[PDB]
Amino acid sequence: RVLCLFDVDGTLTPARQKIDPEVAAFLQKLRSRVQIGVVGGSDYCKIAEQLGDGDEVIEKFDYVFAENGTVQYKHGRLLSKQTIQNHLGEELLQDLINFCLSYMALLRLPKKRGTFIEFRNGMLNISPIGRSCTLEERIEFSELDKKEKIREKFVEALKTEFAGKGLRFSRGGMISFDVFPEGWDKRYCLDSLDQDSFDTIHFFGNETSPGGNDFEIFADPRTVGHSVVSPQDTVQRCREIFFPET
Amino acid sequence: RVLCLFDVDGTLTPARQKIDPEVAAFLQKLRSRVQIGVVGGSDYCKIAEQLGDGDEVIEKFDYVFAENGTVQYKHGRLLSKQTIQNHLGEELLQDLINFCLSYMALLRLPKKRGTFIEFRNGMLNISPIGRSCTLEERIEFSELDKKEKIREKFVEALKTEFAGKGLRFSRGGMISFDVFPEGWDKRYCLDSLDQDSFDTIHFFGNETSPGGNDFEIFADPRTVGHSVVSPQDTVQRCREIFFPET
Ligand SMILES: O=P(O)(O)O[C@H]1O[C@H](CO)[C@@H](O)[C@H](O)[C@@H]1O
Ligand SMILES: O=P(O)(O)O[C@H]1O[C@H](CO)[C@@H](O)[C@H](O)[C@@H]1O
Ligand SMILES: [Mg+2]
Ligand SMILES: [Mg+2]
Ligand SMILES: [Mg+2]
Ligand SMILES: [Mg+2]
């Protein structure tokens, strides 16, 4: 009983884009020997869009872990969600929210819009410009952010304010950063997988160095870790391990 | 060339619910004598959901004005949008946004979530709890709000701060209030309609008294105004005016 578990962006697909039909075809071939799963920081809709038409993703993969595994489809079935408010408690969560509102009230940007704080399943996403900006506005903010280190300074202030309180931050996006509970990196999905009797869980990712969003799940003793540089590399690695004779 | 223009909630449908098939059938009958249109403060998706399946609404009505007419479908065709930032300018808009962020940072509630500021086409929607709350959380906030007058006090502070700057406020919702430019009440749709050569525009609404969201469009010299108390009343009124012989 083996599971191959894959990061999505840069591991199975070009970052944030549709999977190559050849890679998709190989994954289904691999599926004749092992179970296959994906884990990504993006939401289900995004991952679904990258990995097939409609909701095909939950049929094509045995596991679909969205938002680092806080959202789980297991053999086509959506499991219940643990909420961030349940984990953090309402007081810490609101302390965080109000600190962010207060900080952003004092930031002056070329443009602001709406959805400065997006309450997701696995994180709070914080966007100084607001998520409802256009593409050109998005690019404008990104360029300013590089010059003024707006998100970086905001994250420094947050880390210090909440020191010791179990919060983690990532600047994965362009107009935002994510705030998530400690352990709600990709390792989150491993606790559910622990219960599914796999002899071996192979994890493949393209950000397996320190600071990368695959590091923790890669390095976790529950996984056999594989560092890849592209979807073609991932396929080669899988052929080598699971189709040695071929 | 006559247009009948209808508010949606409480005028054609029970508030925020699907239209009665009998009322829907009458509107299509009325359409044999006049053009028919709807104008609502809700977004297109909501109005579409109330008035048919899928996008049937834009086929069933000659005009669909969503968000008070800042979003317009004319004979099945979506017209271009004028944006709030274009109208207000980026400086006033950000002054507004930062005042709201600052104010809300200091509010302590039982629960907070996300989407405190929703940037729509025709307004900014401001929600102290956050739009991404659950139904029970929504009811919890509503009950607290009645006790503490949270939205009312927030709106007082905003009106005073932006006195003379052309902003209007409404507490139409339960967990939020809307901020919109002066004249972006339902009258907004009348400027486009002015260009469409109607001899007469009859407007029907159920909130036509001062303070009601139909008052301005009702009282506008460009419309023949009709006050109704229900969709059955609206139908009766229409039969009386446009099918006098029947
Ligand atoms: O700020 P950006 O560039 O839109 O990226 C953020 O939001 C994306 C969409 O929800 C996420 O997919 C990203 O992971 C990130 O949380
Ligand atoms: O705060 P509430 O109760 O969700 O209502 C507000 O949002 C609704 C949905 O966008 C709108 O339909 C309402 O008109 C209002 O702007
Ligand atoms: Mg990756
Ligand atoms: Mg490992
Ligand atoms: Mg009404
Ligand atoms: Mg009038």
From Swiss-Prot, chains A, B:
Record entry for activity regulation: IMP, a metabolite whose concentration is elevated in anoxia, inhibits phosphomannomutase and phosphoglucomutase activities and strongly enhances glucose-1,6-bisphosphatase activity.
Residue positions binding Mg(2+) 1: D7, D9, N206
Superkingdom of origin: Eukaryota
Keywords (A to Z) from UniProt: Acetylation, Cytoplasm, Isomerase, Magnesium, Metal-binding, Phosphoprotein
Keyword Kinase: no
Catalytic activity: alpha-D-mannose 1-phosphate = D-mannose 6-phosphate
Localisation: Cytoplasm
EC number, as in UniProt: 5.4.2.8
Cofactor(s) recorded in Swiss-Prot or TrEMBL: Mg(2+)
Binding site for alpha-D-mannose 1-phosphate: R16, R120, R131, R138, M174, S176, D178
Expression across tissues: Strong expression in liver, heart, brain, and pancreas; lower expression in skeletal muscle.
The protein's annotated pathway: Nucleotide-sugar biosynthesis; GDP-alpha-D-mannose biosynthesis; alpha-D-mannose 1-phosphate from D-fructose 6-phosphate: step 2/2
UniProt binding sites for Mg(2+) 2: F218, D220, T223
Pfam families: PMM
Residue stretches in coiled coil: none
PANTHER family: PHOSPHOMANNOMUTASE, PHOSPHOMANNOMUTASE 1
Protein's job: Involved in the synthesis of the GDP-mannose and dolichol-phosphate-mannose required for a number of critical mannosyl transfer reactions. In addition, may be responsible for the degradation of glucose-1,6-bisphosphate in ischemic brain.
Family named by the database record: Belongs to the eukaryotic PMM family.
Quaternary structure and partners: Homodimer.
Name by which UniProt lists this protein: Phosphomannomutase 1
Gene from which this protein is expressed: PMM1
